Design a binder for this molecule. Sequence first.
Ligand SMILES: CO[C@@H]1O[C@H](CO)[C@@H](O)[C@@H](O[C@H]2O[C@H](CO)[C@@H](O)[C@H](O)[C@@H]2O)[C@@H]1O
Ligand SMILES: CO[C@@H]1O[C@H](CO)[C@@H](O)[C@H](O[C@H]2O[C@H](CO)[C@@H](O)[C@H](O)[C@@H]2O)[C@@H]1O
Ligand SMILES: CO[C@@H]1O[C@H](CO)[C@@H](O)[C@H](O[C@H]2O[C@H](CO)[C@@H](O)[C@H](O)[C@@H]2O)[C@@H]1O
Ligand SMILES: CO[C@@H]1O[C@H](CO)[C@@H](O)[C@H](O[C@H]2O[C@H](CO)[C@@H](O)[C@H](O)[C@@H]2O)[C@@H]1O
Ligand SMILES: [Ca+2]
Ligand SMILES: [Ca+2]
Ligand SMILES: [Ca+2]
Ligand SMILES: [Ca+2]
Ligand SMILES: [Mn+2]
Ligand SMILES: [Mn+2]
Ligand SMILES: [Mn+2]
Ligand SMILES: [Mn+2]
Lengths: 234, 233, 232, 234
Amino acid sequence: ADTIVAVELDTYPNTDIGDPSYPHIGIDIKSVRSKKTAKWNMQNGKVGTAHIIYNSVGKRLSAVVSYPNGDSATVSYDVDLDNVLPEWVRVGLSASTGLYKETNTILSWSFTSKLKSNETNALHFVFNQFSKDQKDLILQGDATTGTDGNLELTRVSSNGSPQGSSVGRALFYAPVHIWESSAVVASFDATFTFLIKSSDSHPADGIAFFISNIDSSIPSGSTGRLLGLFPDAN
Amino acid sequence: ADTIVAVELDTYPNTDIGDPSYPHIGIDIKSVRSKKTAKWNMQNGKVGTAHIIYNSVGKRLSAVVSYPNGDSATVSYDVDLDNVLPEWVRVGLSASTGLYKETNTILSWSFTSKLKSETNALHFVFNQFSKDQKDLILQGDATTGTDGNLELTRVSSNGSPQGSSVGRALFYAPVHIWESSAVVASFDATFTFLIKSSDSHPADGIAFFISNIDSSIPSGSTGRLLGLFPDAN
Amino acid sequence: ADTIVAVELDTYPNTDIGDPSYPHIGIDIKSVRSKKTAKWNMQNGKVGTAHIIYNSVGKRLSAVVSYPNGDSATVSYDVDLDNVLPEWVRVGLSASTGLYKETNTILSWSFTSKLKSTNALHFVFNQFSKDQKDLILQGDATTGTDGNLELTRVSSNGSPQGSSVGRALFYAPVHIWESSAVVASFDATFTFLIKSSDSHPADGIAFFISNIDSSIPSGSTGRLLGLFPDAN
Amino acid sequence: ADTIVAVELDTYPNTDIGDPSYPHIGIDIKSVRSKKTAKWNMQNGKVGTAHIIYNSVGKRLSAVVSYPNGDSATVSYDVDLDNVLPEWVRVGLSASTGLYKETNTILSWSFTSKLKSNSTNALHFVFNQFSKDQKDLILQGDATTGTDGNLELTRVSSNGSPQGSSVGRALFYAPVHIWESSAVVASFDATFTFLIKSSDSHPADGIAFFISNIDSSIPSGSTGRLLGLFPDAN
Ligand SMILES: CO[C@@H]1O[C@H](CO)[C@@H](O)[C@@H](O[C@H]2O[C@H](CO)[C@@H](O)[C@H](O)[C@@H]2O)[C@@H]1O
Ligand SMILES: CO[C@@H]1O[C@H](CO)[C@@H](O)[C@H](O[C@H]2O[C@H](CO)[C@@H](O)[C@H](O)[C@@H]2O)[C@@H]1O
Ligand SMILES: CO[C@@H]1O[C@H](CO)[C@@H](O)[C@H](O[C@H]2O[C@H](CO)[C@@H](O)[C@H](O)[C@@H]2O)[C@@H]1O
Ligand SMILES: CO[C@@H]1O[C@H](CO)[C@@H](O)[C@H](O[C@H]2O[C@H](CO)[C@@H](O)[C@H](O)[C@@H]2O)[C@@H]1O
Ligand SMILES: [Ca+2]
Ligand SMILES: [Ca+2]
Ligand SMILES: [Ca+2]
Ligand SMILES: [Ca+2]
Ligand SMILES: [Mn+2]
Ligand SMILES: [Mn+2]
Ligand SMILES: [Mn+2]
Ligand SMILES: [Mn+2]
């Protein structure tokens, strides 16, 4: 089974598996049941921004999700990722839909990891436009790149209609060296902008930024509440 | 007085004003009496590296100080800097000596400030300090070099530190460190330093700090006050 | 005199002083009389992007100005800035109007310089505050409250004013070359909105590099772009 | 054959294939015969720095090689890489030895690529320390990394002596999007530091930073003067 650190933007409360009874941002460490959540007012059809911060000094995994009117939700969990994550990982964006559905449109994704000193090893990438054949992204499941310049993690119909029982992920092509014992500071940040839209009063299931073993793949059956991330809801 | 946030590398235990009883790093929030400290083994005449990190999301200001052998000290403090600093600030390095002394040499210094939101950002790096470093406001006893170095406190051309000394270097531009509509207002800073002393103890330390724009060395803030504070409250 | 290096987006053909007979971009080296120009189709009331890059190794100062439709103008000039600029400088944006006028609105501005053997400076403005403390505003510039930098004088339904000159300089001096720098490079990017209902628009926006103490020269409204004392 | 844009630090003059009669930095466009060279004083056993810059506005491919004493050699060639390179590439470092040899030690490598339009897609990586199992590098031929934190492009013997007839390359794992038609600026730069040490009547053959097709492979027989870059000396 893969190892997952994720920040989930969970649009659909699955109260039978420990979701609060509201849409929430969450920090997930090796379980879909978030270690920490914050109530999130998903603004339907608006462009949201998620920013994810971690460094190995503070060891605080933090995420904010904001929309341009100003509504933000933030969540943090102190967690020592040296003890969770393989040294070398892939980083990715994941989304899913189940009985209910939403567009899980990515409009930009940036990522920076650094290992300083003690000098710096670093990876940074930015995608503000996704390309039809995006050679530095590993697309899994239903994830597709436009154009439009967007990354549709899950299936959207010809007529605009998001489809249920969809899951897809984008992972950056290069392995990322997330920690290294000799490093004084290991830090990462990620930001992505997304367009979650539902004509259903029931958007589902959400979007995650995730960190994974290098060979990570969509667990069989991880549509819906499992967010393309987990094989079960344990 | 000034509003001060700082990460002190405090080489001299002033246990009478709250220092722990060893060299230490500490996070100073409007007071020289740190909100959190960690024991710090300062390695005499070694080049050390201090990394300071804040994000507005985590609301946690963290510092690590390390030397090449791997030995490191870390302090974090939970704090919302929106509640502490003014929107606009200067960032700087400060050092002092007192009745005891040490070199407070800065070999490099970087800083990055970002405000989203879109994004405003400032980043500078000094790996070399010119004799005329026009983008630094030197205050008190700093000195720009050669040795290519920034000397926060008085040394002799021949390496020897001086007592009762206080010096700061502030970056020339004001920095917009937070802003009420910023969803992320983060910064980090790193400096490398060489603290050397033949004294009976080393004193007093170097701090990275953030102050109001018009911040000057407060009267009599040599020694334990680290060029930062008007008194020890 | 000030020493000036600039990339002008010159919206008004001053052919008496060597402008080409069309709006143009140019590379200004110690003179308003461009060392190199390219024809520029300014798109009125559109947002444009200027990208300036100087390659210390390549010894080449290059600019593109584009608009969202893909229309671009490009100019490069081969020049060793070690022999032109003083070592310490301020960088900034300058615009002017004269007898004809345009909005000279800056919506964003970024800048990066690096001196390697590495010192660096980078700043990005995507929004300008009404009190933007890290900008030295000169003349009729003017930031906020709409998040924009208004280099010359607009009233207030956005209607441009004539005889206006305004530049904005980053508050910190920049160490733009050094004798012992193996690489002394910079780029700048600014996005702009030039709008006019005049007969022509005038006069243009420049990115400039100048001495630290550089001020708007007396009578540098108009074709002088707030940059130069005369048109030699 | 692969398509190759390289900046070569060529230590050994192969005057029978158009090299000048001195060591040199060269710009190579689809030939080992540099389009532009500059005389280079290789400082044997010193750490050199090479910086390579290009953007699609000036279209000038520039390279400098310097040593701490301040000896530098600069080379530039105007060339439109849109017309040379495939849209998507891998970037790498390559070295070779033939009859004569040298260590071709890489101590750091940074690379940044950006595609800007009207305000970006970007890749940036820095290696200041190469690790024993550096998962984001594709190592080809004799190239090895770490524990000493270096990349040895070509064979160095147990006793420190560089071996002849060696070729190795390191390519960054992810494909790079080097040009894109809708971009108003495409730029890249690369920096690497290196330590070429040789013992006799002797240094060969050089180090190149190169840009190639994604599936670029060491051409058979590309030891020696071909720098691990070219199938032949044409
Ligand atoms: C020698 O120990 C000293 O005690 C003195 C009085 O008992 C007093 O002056 C102390 O302070 C001076 O020196 C230290 C270390 O340099 C500074 O921290 C002080 O601010 C002061 O300058 C010292 O504990
Ligand atoms: C009406 O809500 C649902 O009750 C269903 C009956 O058991 C159940 O299938 C459904 O879950 C499905 O859809 C969810 C929202 O998309 C998703 O989280 C689940 O994994 C599943 O697909 C929900 O409980
Ligand atoms: C009518 O056009 C003008 O011709 C005038 C007579 O020569 C002249 O004064 C005027 O120049 C002014 O306006 C220009 C465009 O705004 C400006 O470039 C000049 O410096 C001057 O202010 C323009 O040529
Ligand atoms: C001593 O000069 C050599 O003459 C040899 C016989 O023709 C020849 O093989 C040799 O070239 C070899 O060594 C070079 C330096 O390493 C290398 O560039 C060649 O590719 C080849 O391996 C050189 O010309
Ligand atoms: Ca859920
Ligand atoms: Ca103390
Ligand atoms: Ca003109
Ligand atoms: Ca050769
Ligand atoms: Mn959840
Ligand atoms: Mn203390
Ligand atoms: Mn002109
Ligand atoms: Mn050659």
